[PDB]
Homo-oligomer: A and B are copies of this chain.
């Protein structure tokens, strides 16, 4: 993800912008105040500004369950059944078709 600078703090973002930033230069970093979100830190008018960007990450929903990644979904259904028949027959995922 080329658009992401680094997990630098608000203060560290300012230090970088003060050292080598110019009008309109920006960086995108993890938010300190809200660790799962981001901040866009911008040099403008001789000052540094910070804008919060809230992330609602991906949700994979199947039946009544929700997973943040497809890998998690897959593993879950190797240990718990993805379908139980009415005869109680539990069907599980075993491995990917090559």
Chain A interface (Cβ < 8 Å from any Cβ of B): 1, 3-5, 16-17, 20-21, 23-28, 38, 40, 42-45, 49, 51-63, 70-71, 73-74, 77, 82-83, 89, 91-98
**Cβ–Cβ contact A42 & B93, under 8 A:** yes
Residues in B neighbouring A51, C-beta threshold 8 A: 62-63, 82-83
B96 touches A40 (CB 8 A): no
Give, as a whole number of angstroms, the nearest-CB distance from A62 to chain B.
5
Q: In the assembled complex, which residues on chain B have CB atoms less than 8 Å from the CB atom of A62?
A: 40, 51-54
- Asked whether, in the complex, the Cβ of B53 is within 8 Å of the Cβ of A61, the reply is yes
Given A44-B91, A82-B42, A91-B45, answer yes or no on A5-B96 (Cβ-Cβ < 8 Å): yes
